[PDB]
Design a binder for these strands. Sequence first.
RNA 1: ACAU
DNA 2: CGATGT
Length: 136
Amino acid sequence: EEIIWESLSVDVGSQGNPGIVEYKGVDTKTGEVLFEREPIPIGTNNMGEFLAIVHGLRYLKERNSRKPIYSDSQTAIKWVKDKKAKSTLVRNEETALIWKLVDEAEEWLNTHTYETPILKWQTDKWGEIKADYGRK
RNA sequence: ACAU
DNA sequence: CGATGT
Ligand SMILES: [K+]
Ligand SMILES: [Mn+2]
Ligand SMILES: [Mn+2]
Ligand SMILES: [Mn+2]
Ligand SMILES: [Mn+2]
Ligand SMILES: [Mn+2]
């Protein structure tokens, strides 16, 4: 209903799907960019959406912040809840990097706690999430 | 049918 | 038009 402006917004960006994947996190209120992941040669949109949330959790935890995280990805929000990224991406040499990062993100979830609310950004009501890359 |  | 997901 109401945007929680005191929040962190995260989003994937890509060149192809599967393709080059990156992600960033921004202050929902100001748009200030707070982190940006270096492009990963091959990944899926949903893997990046997932890594973005987990990085957000780790970022806020390190800084003792209780802000929620917004993501526009139904899939990634569920993967984080389940602590299991059920990606269909083949495991081969090409995809080894992204799969390592995803496996490690899952491992972090299974060994750490958080109270961070993970909220659905309501794109249909509010427009693009503020971490969007503007490529669509 | 919803979300990317 | 194609792909990734529940
Ligand atoms: K969107
Ligand atoms: Mn997104
Ligand atoms: Mn795994
Ligand atoms: Mn986007
Ligand atoms: Mn367009
Ligand atoms: Mn489009």
